[PDB]
């Protein structure tokens with residue numbers, strides 16, 4: 001029922017300036033959206049438009065999406081969810097070996113579970129549907145700076161999610177910077 005063609009024009013005329021027309025943003029401030037899951041894109045946009053998601057730089061996006069209809073946001077969500085994801089590159093000096101170990105096997109000493117167990121072996125996440133009561137957003141190729149910022153919001157409680165708040169608070173700045181670096185290069 002969602003109209004991907006209309007979603008295309010919305011992304012082209014509204015979102016592209018920050019997130020790119022395919023969702024593969026080139027500015028580390030604007031998170032990637034290509035192949036992010038439909039319900040996740042939809043609810044995050046609505047939250048930013050409606051003043052519920054306030055942390056970080058959400059304030060620059062809210063005015064631009066203020067007069068988008070709910071159907072408009074659903075259409076551009078379905079559009080972005082079908083795009084092909086591009087990845088950044090892992091910085092060899094940002095301990096990508098530790099990042100990979102956090103991602104694939106967690107940090108058992110600090111009860112940090114492997115990110116991959118929810119976010120997938122390529123960081124594709126999991127969409128909602130079926131009898132699944134819990135979906136997981138895509139992370140692969142996401143800008144490392146954005147990842148660290150969200151992880152900090154979860155740490156401080158500026159962003160709410162009991163699962164991620166508990167995970168982020170068990171980790172160190174070094175842990176976050178490493179796993180973020182690895183995630184940027186996940187293709």
Ligand code: HEC
Pocket residue numbers: 010011014015016017018019029030031032033040041042044045055056057058060061064065068076077137149
């Ligand atoms: C520049 C003024 C932007 C415009 C135009 C659009 N977005 Fe945006 N968006 C922008 C920023 C700076 C951020 C991050 C805020 C933060 O927490 O620091 C976002 C975030 C999103 C997200 C969440 C992504 C995620 O959680 O991984 C989504 C789903 C999103 N934005 C959607 C979106 C849409 C659909 C847009 C066109 C209608 C759009 N944004 C435009 C900045 C800007």
Ligand code: HEC
Pocket residue numbers: 031102103112113114115116117118119134135136137138139147150151160161163164167179
């Ligand atoms: C299942 C128990 C999970 C584990 C293991 C990890 N994450 Fe997760 N993540 C999970 C959920 C249910 C959500 C969405 C919550 C919400 O606020 O909507 C997330 C989200 C994130 C994000 C934000 C993504 C964004 O686009 O803004 C990040 C940066 C993230 N998760 C990182 C992350 C890392 C680094 C993990 C391994 C240490 C990890 N997650 C594990 C569920 C689960």
